Amino acid sequence: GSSGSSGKCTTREDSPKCKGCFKAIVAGDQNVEYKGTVWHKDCFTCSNCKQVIGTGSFFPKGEDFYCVTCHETKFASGPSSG
Ligand SMILES: [Zn+2]
Ligand SMILES: [Zn+2]
């Protein structure tokens, strides 16, 4: 997929770096930090529908992230015939 998984970490970092865009993230800005990593309120997207979730509630799965809805219809119950 992507040939470039070399460490070569940096001396130090005083800011939460992003994973989607790979751009340093700040506080004032709306983002989603989970277990360290942090995705900009706009970067944080779904894995199924692929829709910017952002601050909005979500459901992180094994090597993926399902937004509330997706998880609401995927796992959680719901009226199929509305
Ligand atoms: Zn980002
Ligand atoms: Zn979704």
UniProtKB/Swiss-Prot annotation:
Domain LIM zinc-binding per the UniProt entry, residue ranges = 18-70
Give the result of residue 49 to F, as annotated: In RBMX1A; the mutant protein initiates aggregation of the FHL1 protein causing reducing bodies formation; dominant-negative effect
Q: Report the outcome of residue 21 to R.
A: In RBMX1B; uncertain significance
**Where is it made, tissue-wise?**
Isoform 1 is highly expressed in skeletal muscle and to a lesser extent in heart, placenta, ovary, prostate, testis, small intestine, colon and spleen. Expression is barely detectable in brain, lung, liver, kidney, pancreas, thymus and peripheral blood leukocytes. Isoform 2 is expressed in brain, skeletal muscle and to a lesser extent in heart, colon, prostate and small intestine. Isoform 3 is expressed in testis, heart and skeletal muscle.
Protein function: May have an involvement in muscle development or hypertrophy.
Subunit-structure text: (Microbial infection) Interacts (via LIM domain 1) with Chikungunya virus non-structural protein 3 (via C-terminus); this interaction is required for viral RNA replication.
Write down the disease named in this UniProt entry. Answer: Emery-Dreifuss muscular dystrophy 6, X-linked: A form of Emery-Dreifuss muscular dystrophy, a degenerative myopathy characterized by weakness and atrophy of muscle without involvement of the nervous system, early contractures of the elbows, Achilles tendons and spine, and cardiomyopathy associated with cardiac conduction defects. Scapuloperoneal myopathy, X-linked dominant: A disease characterized by progressive muscle weakness and wasting, upper and lower limbs weakness, foot drop, scapular winging, and myopathic changes on muscle biopsy. Most affected individuals become wheelchair-bound.
- How is this protein named in the record? Four and a half LIM domains protein 1
Q: Which organism is it from?
A: Homo sapiens
Q: Which gene encodes it?
A: FHL1
Q: Which residues of the full protein are shown?
A: 91 to 159 of 323
